[PDB]
């Protein structure tokens, strides 16, 4: 249930 | 079961004899335990997922926060007669400095 983090962070 | 935001709790450091007598696990000088005793009423304890987190104290001398421990282990969570065990940061500071000095 963790919100997706920016793609830049691998 | 899971908090929506960061949780916090203040807990008193416990006497070594009491820590030792609360568990079957062998305690070493690189550990210390904290938490309220059954007759103190107040509760609180770290638990699964908190591992690695800091146990800090605020100095009344220079008013800075110091990390004295790291959440390490415990038998259950917030059980009467049981305490939270933390890695003794100062005891392992030579190693810390050695690594950072590289």
């Amino acid at each position: 249930d963790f919100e997706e983090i920016p793609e830049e962070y691998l | 079961g899971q908090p929506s935001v960061l949780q916090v709790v203040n807990l008193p450091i416990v006497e070594r004899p009491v820590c030792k007598d609360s568990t079957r696990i062998r305690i070493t000088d690189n550990m210390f335990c904290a938490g309220y005793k059954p007759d103190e009423g107040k509760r609180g304890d770290a638990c699964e997922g908190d591992s690695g987190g800091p146990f800090v104290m605020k100095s009344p001398f220079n008013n800075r926060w110091y990390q004295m421990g790291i959440v390490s282990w415990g038998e259950g969570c917030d059980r009467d007669g049981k305490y939270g065990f933390y890695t003794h940061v100062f005891r392992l500071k030579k190693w810390i400095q050695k690594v950072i000095d590289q």
């Binding site: - | 899971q2 960061l6 203040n10 008193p12 770290a46 638990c47 800090v56 940061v89 100062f90």
Partner: protein, 147 residues
């Protein structure tokens, strides 16, 4: 944290979240001690009995957070690990003696209202504050209950 309370904003600016890449989940708590060093428990990274042996690439550290699950845009900072250092004498075979590990960040993290390092004690500090009866503070995004 069991029987605790909601932390205030900026209350623990040194709190760090060890985040697992895949599956994306909370791994452990940790702490910021300088712009490039994070302190945590050794058993968060290494525990052979369960076949746990994380490498730098398996995780990320999220700093400046408050909310557990949300990506706190413009507030939290996510760093990659350059290297992991586990205490050579960490005793995972028995009692987790010397349960400590350091993680060096690839790039320094910029401090802010929500990101700031905690101090490490010196002898006198430890001696005077580490006494039975004295209270410390523990923080984290772990279980609210044992079961």
């Amino acid at each position: 944290i069991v029987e605790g309370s909601d932390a205030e904003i900026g209350m623990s600016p040194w709190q760090v979240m060890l985040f697992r890449k895949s599956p994306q989940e909370l791994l452990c708590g940790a702490s910021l001690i300088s712009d490039r060093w994070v302190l945590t428990a050794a058993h968060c990274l290494l525990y052979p009995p369960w076949d746990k042996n994380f490498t730098e690439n398996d995780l990320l550290v999220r700093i400046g957070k408050h909310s557990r699950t949300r990506y706190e845009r413009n507030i939290e900072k996510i760093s990659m690990l350059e290297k992991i250092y586990i205490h050579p004498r960490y005793n995972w075979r028995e009692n987790l003696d010397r349960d400590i590990a350091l993680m060096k960040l690839k790039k320094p993290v910029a401090f802010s209202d929500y990101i700031h390092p905690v101090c490490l004690p010196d002898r006198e500090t430890a001696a005077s504050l580490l006494q039975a009866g004295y209270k410390g503070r523990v923080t984290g995004w772990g279980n609210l209950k044992e079961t």
